[PDB]
Design a protein around this nucleic acid. Sequence first.
RNA 1: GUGAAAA
Length: 453
Amino acid sequence: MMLKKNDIVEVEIVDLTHEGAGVAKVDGLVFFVENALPSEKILMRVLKVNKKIGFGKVEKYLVQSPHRNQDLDLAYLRSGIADLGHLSYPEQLKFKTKQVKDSLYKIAGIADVEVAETLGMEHPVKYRNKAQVPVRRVNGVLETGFFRKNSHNLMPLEDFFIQDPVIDQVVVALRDLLRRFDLKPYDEKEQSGLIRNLVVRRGHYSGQIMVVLVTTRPKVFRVDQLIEQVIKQFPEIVSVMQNINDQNTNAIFGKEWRTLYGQDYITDQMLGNDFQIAGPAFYQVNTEMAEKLYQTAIDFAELKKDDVIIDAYSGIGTIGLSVAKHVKEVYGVELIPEAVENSQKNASLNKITNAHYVCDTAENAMKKWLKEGIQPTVILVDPPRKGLTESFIKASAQTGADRIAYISCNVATMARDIKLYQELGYELKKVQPVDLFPQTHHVQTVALLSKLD
RNA sequence: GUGAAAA
Ligand SMILES: Nc1ncnc2c1ncn2[C@@H]1O[C@H](CSCC[C@H](N)C(=O)O)[C@@H](O)[C@H]1O
């Protein structure tokens, strides 16, 4: 055949990638096609031909999937806000379950462990308690929005679909204030301007709002007036922070934080307890579903009064502090000073005195605790996407903890890590996926591993 | 390197 860019070829979509792209096979090439679902027949325009793969685009739909959601605004697909939004919600859940099974088999060689059907959200919309929104000049106008996938091209948006609608309103109000005061958006190309991002977090139960102005420099022209106006429109704002990021980095936050108004934290609830939450601290973005995730992990772990728990990657302390009053001891490790400081305070708020935190990397803390002779019976881990280090895994396995509950937002690194745990005497017992990120391709899981002897 | 998150 010898396909080239611009050729039009008729293909059937036969699979979805982990990121939600349609898969077609033509002349020994695997083609990836945006906005194309399994069983769809399309005319595909060839965009790019590599050696073993190609990239295509839908030129014309000949037959569409019975599971296609016709109502999705394509802006949400292209901006990567809802990159599975073109699929019906029940089939999103089935896709996520399949991804977990496929990953455990392909990466860990596990085919015989029960993976429960992904726990779905009843109304899987408007759920995020945080927005991290770039501010850029687009056609001469200051705009808030989101990047087109695989780019830094800002697509202006006001309705973000999957955010707390109050957050959407706050972001728009802030955008309009930035225009009114003629504050200059960040320009990555020219390394100029002031306003890089607006971050807004709103407590899922409490409704308390933190605004963060992420800027290139300390001085913001008439920020006091800006703050005055925004708190008038939104009296639930308890905190306006500034974060100063003077580097050319894709990391949203730089090192320097300043309180411009009110508190340096919001308070919200999880599993009936109160948690203070700093701007730079992590907080699960779908509180409703994160509670169910935590409860699954707790249920899996079969906690007893004599248990000694490690809460690794503990953040503001939500997981360990949810169980502290039912176990003997909780030991937590968290890298970010502001977050571990939240956890310390949070223990005190909830009258917990058997929770002990260290500010360190998880692997360092694990080695130190192993040296001190801490005797954990249960290790709970909740790492970022990159997963655990081999040194942490090996160290954790030397404790002889009989139960490990791995909470993961990236099944590829979880499966890799599970494969190492299985080499060190742990057996994967069960896996429960939970839909923390509806409308997106992202899968959250909890896995229970238990020590063979 | 954090729903998107280029070089
Ligand atoms: N190498 C490392 N060691 C310890 N903590 C780390 C780390 N890398 C990232 N972190 C922290 O790991 C956390 C992952 S988010 C999970 C936090 C918490 N368990 C919760 O459910 O809310 C973040 O707080 C992040 O700052």
